[PDB]
Design a binder for this molecule. Structure first.
Ligand SMILES: [Zn+2]
Ligand SMILES: [Zn+2]
Lengths: 49, 50, 66, 46, 28
């Protein structure tokens, strides 16, 4: 909404331009969340394009 | 060639940087210019070149 | 289109090296030096990047959008 | 009951249902693309 | 060696242009 008007780089132009595995949201079922602490259930490296 | 008139002409089309005349951006980029290449579209931002 | 997720042989994970590899090229290392910095010793990995062609930046310009 | 396509190069809902000659609501374009389904489908990670 | 040619007023004029455009670019 408030990007600069020089409008050079797409990164400022767009929000959610690049999708990254870090965007994943865990969906624990029932006792899964209780069994395991957070983080340990994740995409391992968080950096993948 | 008229060495004086040509010097009176270069000022209209070029400017000296580090002892060498660099062509003026505003003549190198006519007023209807735009990002032409196979990359990001953009307006006539000679600001960056200057 | 986009860079693949892993090396075709061996199998190392590579989908998080194109951004940084281009960033280092944007630091004017030598391409081989960029690979060395990213730790691609096996040449099957080296080829995976050096011979890549990023098209999606070309295509998405043709992408229709309101 | 009403139907919703989208026009080329403006992508505006043209909302066409009659036997009328097809025509964008605002553009002069004469081509339009159906919207993607809402029904969910599946794919296999192999 | 452009200074071998006696027209030192040119550099002052170029500097005036530089100062103007600098005044324009400093607004960033
Ligand atoms: Zn490999
Ligand atoms: Zn239209």
């Amino acid at each position: 909404p408030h990007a600069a008007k020089d409008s050079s780089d797409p990164n400022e132009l767009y929000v959610n331009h690049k999708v990254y595995t870090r965007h994943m949201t865990w969906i624990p079922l029932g006792n899964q969340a209780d069994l395991f602490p957070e983080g340990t259930i994740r995409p391992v490296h968080d950096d993948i394009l | 060639i008229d060495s004086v008139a040509v010097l009176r002409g270069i000022q209209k089309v070029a400017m000296l940087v580090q002892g060498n005349w660099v062509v003026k951006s505003d003549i190198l980029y006519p007023k209807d210019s735009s990002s032409p290449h196979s990359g990001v579209p953009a307006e006539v931002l000679c600001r960056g070149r200057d | 289109m986009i860079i693949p997720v892993r090396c075709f042989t061996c199998g190392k994970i590579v989908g998080n090296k194109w951004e940084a590899y281009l960033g280092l090229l944007q630091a004017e290392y030598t391409e081989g030096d960029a690979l060395d910095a990213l730790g691609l010793k096996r040449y099957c990995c080296r080829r995976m990047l050096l011979a890549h062609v990023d098209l999606i930046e070309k295509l998405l310009n043709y992408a229709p959008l309101e | 009951q009403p139907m919703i396509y989208i026009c080329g190069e403006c992508h505006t809902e043209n909302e066409i249902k009659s036997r009328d000659p097809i025509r964008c609501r605002e553009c002069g374009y004469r081509i339009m693309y159906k919207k993607r389904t809402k029904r969910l489908v599946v794919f296999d990670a192999r | 060696g452009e200074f071998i040619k006696k027209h030192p007023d040119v550099v002052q004029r170029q500097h005036m242009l530089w100062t103007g455009i600098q005044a324009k670019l400093e607004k960033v």
